[PDB]
C-alpha cells in the first residue's frame, strides 16, 4: 500500500508540474504583451507592475 501510494503521488505531481509550466508560459506571454503595450504608450506602469507580479 505504501509503494502504490508513493508511486501514484509521483504520477500526480509530475502532471501538476506540467500544468504549472503551461500556466507560467501563459503568464509570461501576458507580461510580454503588457510590456509591448507599455512601450507603445497605451498602458501605464501601474498595469506593467500588476502584470509583473
Amino acid at each position: 500500500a505504501s509503494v502504490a501510494t508513493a508511486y501514484l503521488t509521483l504520477k500526480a505531481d509530475q502532471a501538476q508540474l506540467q500544468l504549472t509550466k503551461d500556466t507560467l508560459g501563459t503568464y509570461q506571454k501576458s507580461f510580454d504583451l503588457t510590456q509591448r503595450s507599455y512601450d507603445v504608450g497605451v498602458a501605464s506602469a501601474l498595469d506593467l507592475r500588476q502584470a509583473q507580479t
Partner: protein, 52 residues
C-alpha cells in the same frame, strides 16, 4: 481689401479678409481632437500587429 480696384485678378486670388476670430477657435478645437485621435489610431495600429 487686398486688391487694387479696376485690375485684372486671377482665379483663386484673395480679395478680402473677414476677421476670422471664431473660425480660428473652431479650427483649434477641431485640431486638438484630431491630435489625440490620430496618435491613438497610430498606437493601436502597432498594437494590433502583436495581437495586444
Amino acid at each position: 481689401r487686398l486688391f487694387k480696384e479696376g485690375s485684372d485678378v486671377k482665379a483663386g486670388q484673395q480679395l478680402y479678409q473677414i476677421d476670422p476670430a471664431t473660425y480660428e477657435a473652431d479650427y483649434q478645437s477641431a485640431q486638438a481632437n484630431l491630435a489625440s485621435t490620430q496618435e491613438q489610431a497610430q498606437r493601436y495600429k502597432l498594437l494590433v500587429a502583436d495581437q495586444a
